[PDB]
Amino acid sequence: TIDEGLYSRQLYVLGHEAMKQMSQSNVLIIGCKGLGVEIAKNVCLAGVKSVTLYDPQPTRIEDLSSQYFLTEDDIGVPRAKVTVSKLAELNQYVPVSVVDELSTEYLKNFKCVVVTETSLTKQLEINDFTHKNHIAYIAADSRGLFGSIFCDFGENFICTDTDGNEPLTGMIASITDDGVVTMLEETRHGLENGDFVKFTEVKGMPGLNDGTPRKVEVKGPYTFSIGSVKDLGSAGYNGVFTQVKVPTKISFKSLRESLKDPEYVYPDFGKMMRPPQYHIAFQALSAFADAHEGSLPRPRNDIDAAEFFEFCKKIASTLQFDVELDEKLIKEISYQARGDLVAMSAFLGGAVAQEVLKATTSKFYPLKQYFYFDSLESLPSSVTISEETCKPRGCRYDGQIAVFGSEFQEKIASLSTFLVGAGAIGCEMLKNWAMMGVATGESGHISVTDMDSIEKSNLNRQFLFRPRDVGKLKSECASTAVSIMNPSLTGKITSYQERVGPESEGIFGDEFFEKLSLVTNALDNVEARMYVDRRCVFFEKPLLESGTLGTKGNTQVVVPHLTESYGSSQDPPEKSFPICTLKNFPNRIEHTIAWARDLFEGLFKQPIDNVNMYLSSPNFLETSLKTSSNPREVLENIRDYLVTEKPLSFEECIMWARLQFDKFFNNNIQQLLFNFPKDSVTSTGQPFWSGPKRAPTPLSFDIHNREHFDFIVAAASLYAFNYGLKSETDPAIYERVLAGYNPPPFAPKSGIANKDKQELKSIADSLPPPSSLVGFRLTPAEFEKDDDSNHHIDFITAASNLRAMNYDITPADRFKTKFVAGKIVPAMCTSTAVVSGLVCLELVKLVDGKKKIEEYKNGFFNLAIGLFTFSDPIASPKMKVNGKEIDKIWDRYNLPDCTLQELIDYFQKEEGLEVTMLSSGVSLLYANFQPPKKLAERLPLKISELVEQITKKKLEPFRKHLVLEICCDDANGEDVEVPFICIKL
Amino acid sequence: ALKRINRELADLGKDPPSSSSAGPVGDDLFHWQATIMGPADSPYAGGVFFLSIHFPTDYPFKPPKVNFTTRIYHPNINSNGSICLDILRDQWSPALTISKVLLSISSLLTDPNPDDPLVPEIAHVYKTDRSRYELSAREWTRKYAIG
Ligand SMILES: Nc1ncnc2c1ncn2[C@@H]1O[C@H](COP(=O)(O)OP(=O)(O)OP(=O)(O)O)[C@@H](O)[C@H]1O
Ligand SMILES: [Mg+2]
Ligand SMILES: [Mg+2]
């Protein structure tokens, strides 16, 4: 009963069983500050049964530093009471409540308990109970630029899935008598030692088809071993193996036990001696708060720092910790005790929400057990950070001023950022900017662009939108929501509905880009990422890239004249199958799904386009007769869809669907088996239908079968939609119409001048004239995966399953068909929160203007395994040109709008280089090998005039520069790379 | 992209391909029209086959789209000109030049591969009735690939 219209992207990460178990779990959350509200929001979006909040402390101004459900009108009201109402709107299936008082026994009502902003004594009291009653316990803490997470799921936690990867499967070539299983040619199994596999469709060794898992002993990238199969048989041929995943048992220790001997998780391996320091530091923080009526050390206070360090020494001595305390780091923890950053809150809230989901669903590998994190590299160094600057000012930015100071607040308040995209990452970034106070000054401004609209499936991880907003523009809704969160952003945000690309350079031109301070990408495709990267490189603006995929995520920073661009790296491309595999010889469900998509396009989209173009373009036939690769196909499509097979009712649509069933699932298979019989052999004597090729069998239409009826219904409905007829769904009419159908005879054909053009002309003149059909159009079918009433996914699923039945492939359901055909990218709210936190932690580095490349960090993480890693950005490559150091990426030539000859002479006389090629855009302006006449015609022309002449298009009035790519050779004839040219018009 | 394409074009210009001649269409560097000469020891002898090459925006990180324009009677080439070449669909790497692709296509024309065909009827004729396949190939290369 899962609402797949809302959890579409999340089910591809978790699954149906995981979410079913998740929707029966109760979560208690103690503490309703920024971290608590982040965790609660992520849990509510995830879809747990319910959430209960406990926070009786009255609201204060500083709490607004990272709490975005609190307004300045709520000062003096308990935080939970004012947060429950706003949390109840995120998801309609997840009730949210509040409890005024907590008792120990009450904790038995909840599947998971999350604790924030609670002293260590209360945490011990709660854990002593939750541990022995088998209740998952998570404790999170955020102090300035430091964070801590602790997980305790009980002594006998059972983890079904430990990495989140799909089970490995593959096709076997041969299995020896000693269990040596070999993969097909150039096929890697990917297994690891100790794995379990089950075999099926094994020839010569039926015993392995029972399904009992067997151990794996990897002997190489292409072969492994399963042990002794002597009794079962001597040798096995072909077959498919599938990995089997077995549950693991994880044993956690209580908080009291693990304080003495903790088990650390290391988010970074460059600093492996810190977590032992933070372990003492946080306990000292708790002790200090206990000794000062719950008051943390004041910001940048030396006396409190000394007292805190004395507490740290006492704690280290008491616990017999044989670790030398680092005074600088510990006192830094002391200074930022009262810090409250929205980026740290987002990062830790995403992590903790993922841990809660792990506790409820028993999936993925949890943190075991202490996770201490810091982003101390983000602390500004170009401003004054002292007790005077960091003292509170009685404003909503106190939690941030306590870490960065007022001068850095003034720096932030005058930012001019540009956010590309308004998806999940866009919404999170806008929330973080609103909380941080970005662009709240006189000279600040925010610009956000996105051309898409809000859909139902987007509400599962884009918390700034509501069901009443479905169908509206993302950018406007996001701007309004963030202006509601921070009223100071009223009039400081501009929203565009423009796609960022070559066609929008009149809006995002030189004037627009010259005023920015940084650009943040929130896109989902590589084309726009590359375009924005090129624009930033040209204008020399910092860029913040971030991406997610399921539970994985990464963030990258591009700094002018310091690091390399986004396009300097290469990622794996998309896998496209061979045309021969799809056309005739499929062996996986993906091939059949691709074939079904092609069939959909060729049946309901292309012929309609041809018919419409014929009825509109007066000279379409002549152009097609010599332009298209198959004019006969176009003419046949036009004839069939206009006169020959034009339906007059829905019964004719049903008959057409039956005919197409015969055409595509019964006759083409007969032709293929006539060309290549099942007993045929290759040129080397081996059987033809062996290995990757499966012998098909024609299908006979059975009305009672479910797949056949589904295909007929979908095809008839789509044909009626094409012709605008009234479709029906009652099986009675289909069964009545299809009963009286006589299949035309079909026998495979063995085969065995210029008159063809005469036949084409005869067909052409047989068509009705366009003038006789004015105002008549056929509606094409534009593929839409997200709608379940247009019969698109239904048709694709039916066709794919029928073709799988042809080739004896295991059919898939509509869920997997929608996943594959729609190119759906799995997405999660927790990953979005984590990437937003990391990007906002790099943003403060960008604002401070840090120069060294070691101070920036590109981040990668995988939440299914609890892996976090950070690495320095790659420096931009250097080069030697004319005995000078040139940056390959961030350097350019600035030249006037001189003539081509003058440009060549300048490059010859200044750089001592001979120009051999000059191009602009996708046109070759000048080449050394062109005939002399062409050059003599082109040489005395200006660059702008030359570009206009070659591209046959006048330059736009808003165009102010030209980017030219030049390849030149040195005096000796050696090719030397040079930076691009920036011609100023 | 542009620099790599121009380097390939210059390399073609410096050393003639003899049996091939590729060049940009008009002045566009992302659309080439290549020519292939039928091998002497093949049914397509004395034939000129025109191919259209479309370099993707991500070249050389994505394979160029190569499609025959002249009609050819080959087991691995269909009516739309699509070529069953492994180096153009999933084996593509940013290390293969257009000269290598043209050489591969010429070798394919030299000897077809009927065991993994793209046109099952032509492959069946090739495997069963070789003489009729030869006659049909000669007829097609005389009717379409000449003049
Ligand atoms: N070239 C572009 N210019 C501007 N905005 C873009 C561009 N390409 C993508 N976007 C926007 O980037 C955002 C990407 O976010 P996201 O992928 O989460 O949303 P979606 O694609 O609408 O959803 P889903 O992929 O889950 O169906 C979308 O708002 C999309 O409109
Ligand atoms: Mg969308
Ligand atoms: Mg998307």
mmCIF file with all atom_site columns, N, CA and C in Angstrom, chain A residues 26 47 60 136 163 235 341 370 401 430 468 569 574 597 629-630 649 655 703 816 835 918 924:
data_model
loop_
_atom_site.group_PDB
_atom_site.id
_atom_site.type_symbol
_atom_site.label_atom_id
_atom_site.label_alt_id
_atom_site.label_comp_id
_atom_site.label_asym_id
_atom_site.label_entity_id
_atom_site.label_seq_id
_atom_site.pdbx_PDB_ins_code
_atom_site.Cartn_x
_atom_site.Cartn_y
_atom_site.Cartn_z
_atom_site.occupancy
_atom_site.B_iso_or_equiv
_atom_site.pdbx_formal_charge
_atom_site.auth_seq_id
_atom_site.auth_comp_id
_atom_site.auth_asym_id
_atom_site.auth_atom_id
_atom_site.pdbx_PDB_model_num
ATOM 1  N N  . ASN A 1 26  ? 8.114   3.843   15.159  1.00 0.00 ? 26  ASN A N  1
ATOM 2  C CA . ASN A 1 26  ? 7.965   5.129   15.824  1.00 0.00 ? 26  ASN A CA 1
ATOM 3  C C  . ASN A 1 26  ? 9.334   5.687   16.190  1.00 0.00 ? 26  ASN A C  1
ATOM 4  N N  . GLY A 1 47  ? 9.255   8.764   5.677   1.00 0.00 ? 47  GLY A N  1
ATOM 5  C CA . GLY A 1 47  ? 7.979   8.076   5.714   1.00 0.00 ? 47  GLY A CA 1
ATOM 6  C C  . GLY A 1 47  ? 7.791   7.105   6.863   1.00 0.00 ? 47  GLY A C  1
ATOM 7  N N  . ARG A 1 60  ? 14.523  31.150  22.035  1.00 0.00 ? 60  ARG A N  1
ATOM 8  C CA . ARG A 1 60  ? 15.368  32.325  22.178  1.00 0.00 ? 60  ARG A CA 1
ATOM 9  C C  . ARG A 1 60  ? 15.809  32.784  20.795  1.00 0.00 ? 60  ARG A C  1
ATOM 10 N N  . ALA A 1 136 ? 16.691  1.124   19.534  1.00 0.00 ? 136 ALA A N  1
ATOM 11 C CA . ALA A 1 136 ? 17.800  1.810   18.891  1.00 0.00 ? 136 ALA A CA 1
ATOM 12 C C  . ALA A 1 136 ? 17.974  3.201   19.486  1.00 0.00 ? 136 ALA A C  1
ATOM 13 N N  . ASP A 1 163 ? 25.905  -3.305  2.114   1.00 0.00 ? 163 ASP A N  1
ATOM 14 C CA . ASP A 1 163 ? 26.507  -2.345  1.196   1.00 0.00 ? 163 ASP A CA 1
ATOM 15 C C  . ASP A 1 163 ? 25.515  -1.656  0.273   1.00 0.00 ? 163 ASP A C  1
ATOM 16 N N  . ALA A 1 235 ? 31.473  -31.950 -16.078 1.00 0.00 ? 235 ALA A N  1
ATOM 17 C CA . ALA A 1 235 ? 31.642  -30.616 -16.631 1.00 0.00 ? 235 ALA A CA 1
ATOM 18 C C  . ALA A 1 235 ? 30.270  -30.028 -16.922 1.00 0.00 ? 235 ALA A C  1
ATOM 19 N N  . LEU A 1 341 ? 25.881  26.372  13.443  1.00 0.00 ? 341 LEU A N  1
ATOM 20 C CA . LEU A 1 341 ? 25.954  26.581  12.006  1.00 0.00 ? 341 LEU A CA 1
ATOM 21 C C  . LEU A 1 341 ? 24.922  25.715  11.299  1.00 0.00 ? 341 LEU A C  1
ATOM 22 N N  . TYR A 1 370 ? 31.246  5.512   17.383  1.00 0.00 ? 370 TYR A N  1
ATOM 23 C CA . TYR A 1 370 ? 31.514  6.935   17.532  1.00 0.00 ? 370 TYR A CA 1
ATOM 24 C C  . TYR A 1 370 ? 31.991  7.507   16.206  1.00 0.00 ? 370 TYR A C  1
ATOM 25 N N  . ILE A 1 401 ? 27.748  34.184  14.505  1.00 0.00 ? 401 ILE A N  1
ATOM 26 C CA . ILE A 1 401 ? 28.719  35.188  14.925  1.00 0.00 ? 401 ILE A CA 1
ATOM 27 C C  . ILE A 1 401 ? 29.628  34.632  16.008  1.00 0.00 ? 401 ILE A C  1
ATOM 28 N N  . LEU A 1 430 ? 19.261  27.042  -0.889  1.00 0.00 ? 430 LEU A N  1
ATOM 29 C CA . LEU A 1 430 ? 18.531  28.267  -0.585  1.00 0.00 ? 430 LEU A CA 1
ATOM 30 C C  . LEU A 1 430 ? 18.220  28.367  0.902   1.00 0.00 ? 430 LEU A C  1
ATOM 31 N N  . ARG A 1 468 ? -0.189  21.795  -2.682  1.00 0.00 ? 468 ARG A N  1
ATOM 32 C CA . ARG A 1 468 ? -0.902  22.880  -3.344  1.00 0.00 ? 468 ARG A CA 1
ATOM 33 C C  . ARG A 1 468 ? -0.048  23.590  -4.385  1.00 0.00 ? 468 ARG A C  1
ATOM 34 N N  . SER A 1 569 ? 37.983  16.665  -15.917 1.00 0.00 ? 569 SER A N  1
ATOM 35 C CA . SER A 1 569 ? 37.890  15.275  -15.506 1.00 0.00 ? 569 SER A CA 1
ATOM 36 C C  . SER A 1 569 ? 36.859  14.548  -16.359 1.00 0.00 ? 569 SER A C  1
ATOM 37 N N  . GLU A 1 574 ? 27.445  6.576   -20.570 1.00 0.00 ? 574 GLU A N  1
ATOM 38 C CA . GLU A 1 574 ? 26.297  5.683   -20.571 1.00 0.00 ? 574 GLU A CA 1
ATOM 39 C C  . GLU A 1 574 ? 26.551  4.493   -21.490 1.00 0.00 ? 574 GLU A C  1
ATOM 40 N N  . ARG A 1 597 ? 10.855  0.438   -26.210 1.00 0.00 ? 597 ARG A N  1
ATOM 41 C CA . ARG A 1 597 ? 10.841  1.892   -26.342 1.00 0.00 ? 597 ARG A CA 1
ATOM 42 C C  . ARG A 1 597 ? 10.973  2.311   -27.801 1.00 0.00 ? 597 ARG A C  1
ATOM 43 N N  . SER A 1 629 ? 16.784  8.966   -45.388 1.00 0.00 ? 629 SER A N  1
ATOM 44 C CA . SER A 1 629 ? 17.466  7.724   -45.727 1.00 0.00 ? 629 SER A CA 1
ATOM 45 C C  . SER A 1 629 ? 16.525  6.651   -46.262 1.00 0.00 ? 629 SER A C  1
ATOM 46 N N  . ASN A 1 630 ? 15.212  6.847   -46.160 1.00 0.00 ? 630 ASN A N  1
ATOM 47 C CA . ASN A 1 630 ? 14.237  5.867   -46.643 1.00 0.00 ? 630 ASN A CA 1
ATOM 48 C C  . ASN A 1 630 ? 12.957  6.591   -47.029 1.00 0.00 ? 630 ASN A C  1
ATOM 49 N N  . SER A 1 649 ? -13.493 3.712   -35.771 1.00 0.00 ? 649 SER A N  1
ATOM 50 C CA . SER A 1 649 ? -14.033 3.446   -34.447 1.00 0.00 ? 649 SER A CA 1
ATOM 51 C C  . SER A 1 649 ? -12.945 2.772   -33.623 1.00 0.00 ? 649 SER A C  1
ATOM 52 N N  . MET A 1 655 ? -8.537  -4.148  -33.701 1.00 0.00 ? 655 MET A N  1
ATOM 53 C CA . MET A 1 655 ? -8.074  -5.007  -34.787 1.00 0.00 ? 655 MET A CA 1
ATOM 54 C C  . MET A 1 655 ? -6.648  -4.653  -35.191 1.00 0.00 ? 655 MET A C  1
ATOM 55 N N  . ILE A 1 703 ? -6.215  -14.943 -25.772 1.00 0.00 ? 703 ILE A N  1
ATOM 56 C CA . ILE A 1 703 ? -6.893  -13.801 -25.167 1.00 0.00 ? 703 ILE A CA 1
ATOM 57 C C  . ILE A 1 703 ? -6.912  -13.918 -23.649 1.00 0.00 ? 703 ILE A C  1
ATOM 58 N N  . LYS A 1 816 ? 10.264  -2.032  -12.369 1.00 0.00 ? 816 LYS A N  1
ATOM 59 C CA . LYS A 1 816 ? 11.585  -2.075  -12.984 1.00 0.00 ? 816 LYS A CA 1
ATOM 60 C C  . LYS A 1 816 ? 11.551  -1.523  -14.402 1.00 0.00 ? 816 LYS A C  1
ATOM 61 N N  . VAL A 1 835 ? 25.076  16.791  1.059   1.00 0.00 ? 835 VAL A N  1
ATOM 62 C CA . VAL A 1 835 ? 25.803  17.539  0.038   1.00 0.00 ? 835 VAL A CA 1
ATOM 63 C C  . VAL A 1 835 ? 25.604  19.036  0.229   1.00 0.00 ? 835 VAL A C  1
ATOM 64 N N  . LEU A 1 918 ? 42.371  28.374  -36.806 1.00 0.00 ? 918 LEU A N  1
ATOM 65 C CA . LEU A 1 918 ? 41.613  29.313  -35.989 1.00 0.00 ? 918 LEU A CA 1
ATOM 66 C C  . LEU A 1 918 ? 40.137  29.010  -36.180 1.00 0.00 ? 918 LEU A C  1
ATOM 67 N N  . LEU A 1 924 ? 35.146  26.488  -38.770 1.00 0.00 ? 924 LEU A N  1
ATOM 68 C CA . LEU A 1 924 ? 36.574  26.627  -39.045 1.00 0.00 ? 924 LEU A CA 1
ATOM 69 C C  . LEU A 1 924 ? 36.789  27.960  -39.751 1.00 0.00 ? 924 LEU A C  1
#
